Ligand binder design. Structure first.
Ligand SMILES: Nc1ncnc2c1ncn2[C@@H]1O[C@H](COP(=O)(O)OP(=O)(O)OP(O)(O)=S)[C@@H](O)[C@H]1O
Ligand SMILES: Nc1ncnc2c1ncn2[C@@H]1O[C@H](COP(=O)(O)OP(=O)(O)OP(O)(O)=S)[C@@H](O)[C@H]1O
Ligand SMILES: Nc1ncnc2c1ncn2[C@@H]1O[C@H](COP(=O)(O)OP(=O)(O)OP(O)(O)=S)[C@@H](O)[C@H]1O
Ligand SMILES: N[C@@H](CCC(=O)O)C(=O)O
Ligand SMILES: C[C@@H](O)[C@H](N)C(=O)O
Ligand SMILES: [Mg+2]
Ligand SMILES: [Mg+2]
Ligand SMILES: [Mg+2]
Lengths: 293, 315, 170, 325, 340
């Protein structure tokens, strides 16, 4: 095509899945679209405290053309409510839709979404907006100062998130500890109306594939030390939709209080970065210690 | 980093709180006795109400402060549902405390609570007064509904005197090893107008700015309270003097006309020397000028005309 | 650390701080209400905070309910005589299977049965959240239905409203 | 890209060294950041004195060029109700820094537009999280701020811009552009600025536009008056002289001619005459009272429209009657 | 561990959750009494017009331990009851938020539960924070473990004896199909094992009916509109009617619309019916509608008889209702209309 970027596919599950994953970040706000030869990424940020990035790779599209030469990537911003409404009306007859193509022609042009059916094609153009000065790359995991890492199965994490949500969890604490004889302890401690509750993942290579505590440098493994991360549930719960489709989840917390969740569902890959609370109260610390001991 | 002096030197104990000596002594008596009743603490900003209530709770509950105190303020959710669930569950909690000690529910800025929540608090206080006690903190005691006031002992804090402000300022200076002069401390106290939070903020700003707290150095950053300037302007016996004050001391310093007229109304409300007829006529003229300003004509000419009319009223 | 206003609370009607004429009027009104076919179904008491409305109502109930309650035919919940002379509505009660606005509706639907051998005085001091418009409308509808109810037997219903001004709130 | 911007935004200070006319405040804040002891700040002042520019420059100095990542800026164009304070501001203030870059900064520009409930909610947010966060409030009207918020903040007053700072900024703009300004033109520009740099920049841009050949033409006071359509001092002096010395017919004719020569507005003439009379030495004080009252009434009436000729005759008659005392 | 018990079977967990949910619907706070032989979860509404009680025998739990002598904190809940034979029995009673317990005890939509343990620790070696908290440990089939410690307040227990008196009166009046004799013997055994002991005043009426028909009829009964239930029984039929009376306003304006829906069951269909020689009784429907759905939650094939027993004497007098399961006893007492 004559467009700078044009990607067409026959699977409509990827688009709706990505939109559903992005929904928990606000039904009426902005979404950033990054376009490059590797693929197309959707980025959202909330309150400068949490960030989500969902990547659709080149393999997911039956055809993918990126003819831009001056710039190696293209950045645009759209309103999520517009896309949500347009797709909801256009996707009412989900059985008949056969092709879906995205297109873009550089700055100053709309983002074009076309649903192609057997004999009817629907074309919608989304207006673009200036990108806010805030840089989404600011909230990133310092890969040289990982406090701990863990690999978890998607279903168990999704069940834990559902349990936390249903009890009206208000504060969450991620507790990670390692010992000898391959003893691992990964737990989520919730402060809610019920008081203090705990959800502990088993130390087996089917729900907790691996767990490591690196003493805040990613190199030296230390046993007997416990890493505790304090988060507000309003931001922690925003990964529930992503975990619903997730096949594997990788938690990585650094010393700067940044937690990164890598969700793997050819596929959809999601990155969620969140900041930790300023500090933990004495009562919360005492309750957590009593729960874990 | 280093905390600002206002938060760094917040008292931890009742003994370090100055001003309202009788009230603080009563609070210390309650703290050392234990039988704390429902209480309301009212007063102007920055005089130690929050500090006093928190210190009293800490001293009363000792190690049990974490599990025996429930603190809520205007920045938290405090609707009727909160009263129905969180406060109710806290008051129902069975906590073993030393004899004469009770759980404390601190409601800072209680005046802002909604009517429904305040009405709901009545039954909670009636049912759980045996093991729970409420400490309301507010600026306007009348903003708490009468049924709640009926159960509480009232405690009104007065504005701090220059002596107590000077004493605590000297303590802070001794702790910080700050070089100063007497005139500088007098200027700081004069500008504070009885608000100690402002006094400490201005002291820190002056110490940073020049290191030595002099009157000239204090007045370089901190300005004299504009209400006193407005009072001097209004009480001037000559129209020329009033106009000169309005120009040099208020208009040329960037004070907005709306602020000037509002301050003029507030000051005129408390002019004891003037007669009642003159006072009400001045209030009428100030109100007319305020109405003109609100329409968009916020000019120096309107303020000058208001001053001229006030002077006519005086004659 | 017992509070004096509770420690020295009245233990009989004679110690209630109430004007004699007002006490006589209230007692006569309630006694008439306790009749089998009493003309009055709701006694509404209004006044400022802490004027002995609920206190006098409870003290009068302690005498009136035993006088008019029918003796049970050897039937009762527990062994004790079930001293529940006053049945009070709780505005903070929340149950699983009931919307909030319906709570009061449920209470009355139970209170209707407290007659004859189960006689009890219904007292409404902790009102529902009448600041909510829909809740207030439902409350008024329920009060009207109680007033216009065709049930031959109803218990005396006393509503105590403490009148106060709502301070201006931001 | 900066070339296409209006001069008011093109010349926005980027560093604290570029903010003029606020030496005391600027020195205090610079040394505060040098010592890393920034308290909660309030910047109170009239329009166009450098409050927003100063706070943005301070944020840049504190956080270098990545201030946008650890600075939360909110203004009147955004909703700032009590829900916003409870959720967004609270969550930002209670979270750790991006890379442990000291403390976070929250800027509440035009905070006088916030509601009382939101301001009340802000008190404990400011107090509790002082260690991790610092608040900056900016305002033109202090009466809209609650006493508690004022008590919690260290106050700094941005005065109307002094003449020397305006001259230095004008010289900087003139060297930046290829523009020439006459001393009388600069004096008139400062006089009409009223301590607002935005007005100076806008009028200078309009004057440059007015020049047929800006590469060589010099801006004179006449160019400034043409661009602003304001009366000259000579016109005001002539009108006042005619009012105070000539008869009613002569004064009416003089006013009409002076106004019709350049299409001057009556309100501008009234303001100029008021400024002139403020320096007059009056031996009778009732004259000042009558002048002020009647001229304020005429200004208020003009603000709502009305008949222009009747208003001009009213000005003439008011001045004559006041000076007849 | 002052007290501990565990539930493993899926049906047992279902019935436990259903009982807790129903009790939570009755009152905001549920009362739990622990004894050496059973656990009693009960609730009474604000108007004192309805009482519900579910007794789980110690055999209902895979593991059961009760050590009253070890309780130190919250001793106000410890009670001693003297038996008629000269025996002392220890009890521990407390109050717990019903909604919280219901939320804790529900089965997750996706993952099943392998074990559900409830325990109380008020012994000497108990941290001050953990005092007066009910420990709930839930094991998931995926080896995930969940822990909750909701707060509880110790209280005193006042046994309700209405059922015992009704049973004694029924035995005296009506005490031949072998099932009737078996019922009489079971009632006598229950009365004897309990810790406590032809005029018109001795009226008593008993109805044993298969709860399937009642549940089927009630499924269509919306309590939000039909808030009254009337039972009319004669020697030929039994009719259950969900109804509501009309209310007329000032000018005969319909403030509330009357409604009625009735169902009739032949006396042959009913398991048992004994009358004091057309009885009628009226009471509230919501509590009965919720109560009738607890027993079926287990669905035990062996000795499967979802029969509900009802006892009623006179208008105004309480109506008693009982259901049984291999290790569960469900009782509901309601206040009846005094008219006529
Ligand atoms: N009496 C006092 N003695 C010593 N320091 C004081 C006193 N009053 C105020 N301060 C200082 O000011 C700070 C704020 O005091 P607070 O008690 O929080 O103010 P406040 O009286 O609660 O005003 P409001 O109602 O909250 S606006 C304290 O942390 C102290 O540093
Ligand atoms: N002699 C007394 N007479 C009346 N009340 C007394 C007396 N001594 C103590 N009290 C207590 O004083 C309180 C005031 O009486 P109430 O009847 O509760 O007030 P009120 O008129 O109902 O207004 P509200 O709605 O409760 S604020 C009650 O808690 C009484 O128990
Ligand atoms: N002190 C100053 N030094 C240099 N330029 C200034 C100064 N103050 C204002 N300006 C100019 O005027 C423009 C507007 O300045 P601002 O700081 O945004 O005005 P302000 O003080 O925020 O007034 P308000 O309250 O927003 S109406 C800047 O971009 C500069 O071009
Ligand atoms: N009307 C005044 C003259 C005022 C003046 O000339 O200043 C006479 O005397
Ligand atoms: C001119 C005359 O009126 C003067 N102003 C006096 O006397
Ligand atoms: Mg305070
Ligand atoms: Mg009362
Ligand atoms: Mg600004």
């Amino acid at each position: 095509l004559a467009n700078k970027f044009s990607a067409s596919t026959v699977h409509l599950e990827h688009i709706t899945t990505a939109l559903s994953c992005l929904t928990p970040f606000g039904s009426k706000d902005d979404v950033l679209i990054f376009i490059d030869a590797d693929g197309l990424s959707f980025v959202r940020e909330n309150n400068h405290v949490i960030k989500i990035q969902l990547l659709l790779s080149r393999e997911l599209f039956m055809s993918y053309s990126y003819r831009n030469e001056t710039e190696d990537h293209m950045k645009l911003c759209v309103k999520i409510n517009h896309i949500l409404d347009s797709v909801s009306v256009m996707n009412r007859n989900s059985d008949d839709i056969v092709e879906c193509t995205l297109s873009y022609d550089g700055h100053g042009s709309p983002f074009v979404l076309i649903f192609e059916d057997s004999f009817i094609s629907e074309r919608v153009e989304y207006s673009t907006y200036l990108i806010k000065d805030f840089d989404t790359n600011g909230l990133e995991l310092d890969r040289e100062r990982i406090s701990f890492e863990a690999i978890i199965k998607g279903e168990a994490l999704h069940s834990a998130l559902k349990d936390l949500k249903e009890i009206g969890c208000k504060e969450c604490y991620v507790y990670a500890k390692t010992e000898a004889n391959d003893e691992n302890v990964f737990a989520l401690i919730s402060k809610s109306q019920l008081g203090f509750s705990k959800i502990k993942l088993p130390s087996n290579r089917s729900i907790l594939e691996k767990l490591q505590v690196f003493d805040g440098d990613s190199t030296t493994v230390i046993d007997g030390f416990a890493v505790i991360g304090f988060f507000d549930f309003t931001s922690f719960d925003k990964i529930r939709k992503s975990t619903k489709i997730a096949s594997k989840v990788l938690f990585r917390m650094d010393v700067h209080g940044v937690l990164s969740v890598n969700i793997l569902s050819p596929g959809i890959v999601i990155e969620v970065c969140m900041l930790e609370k300023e500090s933990i109260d004495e009562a919360a610390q005492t309750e957590i210690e009593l729960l874990m001991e | 980093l280093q905390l600002p002096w206002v938060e760094k030197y917040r008292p931890q104990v009742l003994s370090d709180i100055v001003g309202n000596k009788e009230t603080i002594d009563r609070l210390q008596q309650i703290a050392k006795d234990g039988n704390m009743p429902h209480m309301i603490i009212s007063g102007m900003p920055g005089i130690g109400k929050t500090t006093s209530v928190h210190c009293l709770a800490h001293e009363l509950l000792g190690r049990s402060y974490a599990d025996g105190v429930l603190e809520l303020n205007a920045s938290d959710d405090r609707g009727i549902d909160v009263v129905r669930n969180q406060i109710k569950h806290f008051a129902q909690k069975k906590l073993h405390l030393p004899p004469g000690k009770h759980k404390i529910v601190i409601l800072d800025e209680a005046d802002s609570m909604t009517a429904g929540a305040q009405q709901a608090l009545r039954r909670t206080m009636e049912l759980y007064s045996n093991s729970t006690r409420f400490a309301f903190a507010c600026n306007q005691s009348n903003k708490i509904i009468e049924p709640l006031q009926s159960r509480c002992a009232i405690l009104r804090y007065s504005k701090l005197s220059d002596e107590d402000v000077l004493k605590r300022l000297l303590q802070i200076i001794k702790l910080e090893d700050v070089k100063y002069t007497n005139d500088g401390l007098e200027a700081i106290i004069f500008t504070a107008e009885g608000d100690m939070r402002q006094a400490i903020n201005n002291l820190q700003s002056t110490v940073a700015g020049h290191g030595l707290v002099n009157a000239d150095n204090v007045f370089k950053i901190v300005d004299s309270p504009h209400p006193l300037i407005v009072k001097k302007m209004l009480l001037a016996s000559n129209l020329e003097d009033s106009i000169q004050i309005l120009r040099t001391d208020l208009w040329k310093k960037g004070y907005s006309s709306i602020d000037i007229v509002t301050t003029s109304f507030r000051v005129t409300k408390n002019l004891a020397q003037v007669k009642e007829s003159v006072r009400l006529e001045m209030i009428k003229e100030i109100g007319l000028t305020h109405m003109r300003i609100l329409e968009g004509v916020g000019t120096y000419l309107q303020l000058a005309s208001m001053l001229a009319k006030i002077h006519k009223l005086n004659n | 650390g017992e509070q004096w206003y509770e420690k020295f609370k009245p233990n009989c009607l004679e110690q209630v701080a109430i004007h004699k004429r007002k006490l006589k009027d209230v007692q006569e009104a309630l006694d008439a209400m306790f009749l089998p076919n009493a003309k009055h179904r709701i006694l509404l008491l209004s006044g400022p905070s802490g004027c002995s409305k609920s206190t006098v109502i409870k003290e009068l109930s302690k005498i009136l309910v035993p006088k008019y309650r029918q003796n049970s035919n050897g039937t009762s919940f527990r062994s004790t005589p079930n001293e529940h002379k006053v049945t009070e509505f709780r505005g903070d009660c929340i149950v699983n299977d009931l919307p909030q606005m319906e709570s009061f509706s449920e209470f009355l639907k139970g209170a209707r049965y407290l007659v004859m051998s189960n006689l009890s005085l219904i007292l409404i001091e902790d009102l529902p959240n009448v600041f909510h418009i829909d809740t207030r409308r439902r409350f008024q509808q329920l009060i009207l239905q109680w007033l216009y109810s065709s049930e031959p037997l109803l218990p005396p219903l006393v509503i105590c409203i403490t009148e106060c001004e709502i301070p201006e709130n931001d | 890209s900066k070339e296409n911007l209006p001069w008011v935004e093109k010349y926005r200070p980027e560093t604290l060294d570029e903010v003029y006319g606020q030496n005391e405040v600027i020195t205090t804040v610079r040394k505060f950041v040098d010592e890393g002891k920034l308290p909660h700040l309030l910047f109170y002042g009239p329009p166009g004195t450098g409050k927003t520019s100063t706070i943005v420059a301070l944020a840049r100095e504190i956080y270098g060029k990545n201030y946008s990542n650890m600075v939360l800026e909110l203004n009147a164009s955004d909703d700032r109700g009590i829900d916003v304070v409870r959720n967004q501001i609270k969550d930002f203030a209670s979270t750790r820094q991006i890379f442990s870059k000291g403390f976070k900064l929250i800027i509440l520009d035009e905070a006088d537009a916030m509601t009382n409930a939101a301001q009340n909610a802000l008190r404990r947010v400011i107090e509790r999280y002082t260690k991790n966060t610092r608040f900056c409030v900016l305002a033109n009207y202090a009466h809209k701020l609650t006493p508690a918020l004022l008590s919690r903040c260290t106050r700094f007053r941005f005065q109307p811009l002094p003449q020397e700072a305006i001259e230095r900024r004008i010289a900087n703009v003139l060297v930046h552009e290829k523009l020439k300004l006459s001393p009388n033109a600069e004096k008139a520009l400062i006089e009409l600025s009223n301590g607002d740099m935005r007005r100076v920049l806008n009028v200078l841009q309009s004057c440059k536009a007015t020049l047929d050949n800006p590469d060589e033409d010099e801006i004179s006071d006449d160019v400034i008056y043409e661009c602003c359509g304001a009366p000259r001092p000579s016109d005001l002096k002539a009108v006042l002289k005619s009012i105070l010395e000539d008869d009613w017919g002569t004064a009416h004719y003089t006013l009409n001619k002076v106004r019709s020569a350049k299409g001057l507005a009556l309100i501008d003439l009234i303001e100029g005459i008021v400024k002139i009379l403020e320096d007059y030495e009056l031996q009778n004080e009732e004259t000042r009272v009558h002048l002020l009252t009647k001229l304020a009434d005429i200004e208020y009436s003009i603000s709502k429209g009305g008949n222009d000729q009747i208003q001009g005759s009213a000005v003439i008659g008011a001045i004559k009657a006041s000076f007849e005392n | 561990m002052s007290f501990k018990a565990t539930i493993t079977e899926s049906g047992k967990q279902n019935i436990w959750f259903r009982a807790i949910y129903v009790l939570s619907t009755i009152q905001d706070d549920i009362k739990i009494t622990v004894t050496t032989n059973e656990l009693i979860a009960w609730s009474m509404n604000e108007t004192d017009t309805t009482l519900c009680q579910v007794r789980f025998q110690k055999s209902f739990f895979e593991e059961y331990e009760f050590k009253p002598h070890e309780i130190v904190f919250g001793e106000n809940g410890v009670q001693v009851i003297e038996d008629t034979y000269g025996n002392s029995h220890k009890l521990y009673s407390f109050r717990v938020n019903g909604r919280h317990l219901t939320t804790i005890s529900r089965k997750p939509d996706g993952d099943g539960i392998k074990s559900f343990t409830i325990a109380v620790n008020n012994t000497s070696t108990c941290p001050e924070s953990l005092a007066n908290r009910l420990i709930v440990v839930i094991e998931m089939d995926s080896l995930i473990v969940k822990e909750y410690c909701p707060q509880f307040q110790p209280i005193k227990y006042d046994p309700i004896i209405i059922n015992l008196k009704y049973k004694r009166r029924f035995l005296d009046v009506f005490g031949l199909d072998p099932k009737l004799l078996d019922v009489f013997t079971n009632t006598e055994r229950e009365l004897t094992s309990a810790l406590f002991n032809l005029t018109a005043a001795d009226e008593i009426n008993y109805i044993c009916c298969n709860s399937t028909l009642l549940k089927n009829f009630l499924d269509n009964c919306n309590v939000n509109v039909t808030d009254e239930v009337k039972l009319e029984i004669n020697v030929h039929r039994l009719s259950i009617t969900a109804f509501t009376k009309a209310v007329y306003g000032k000018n005969n304006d319909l403030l509330r619309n009357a409604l009625s829906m009735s169902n009739t069951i032949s006396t042959l269909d009913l398991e048992h019916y004994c009358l004091f020689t057309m009885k009628s009784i009226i009471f509230k429907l919501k509590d009965f509608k919720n109560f009738i759905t607890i027993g079926p939650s287990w669905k035990t094939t062996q000795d499967g008889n979802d029969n509900i027993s009802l006892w009623f004497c006179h208008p105004g007098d309480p109506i008693l209702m009982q259901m049984q399961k291999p290790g569960v006893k469900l009782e509901l007492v309601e206040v009846t209309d005094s008219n006529i």
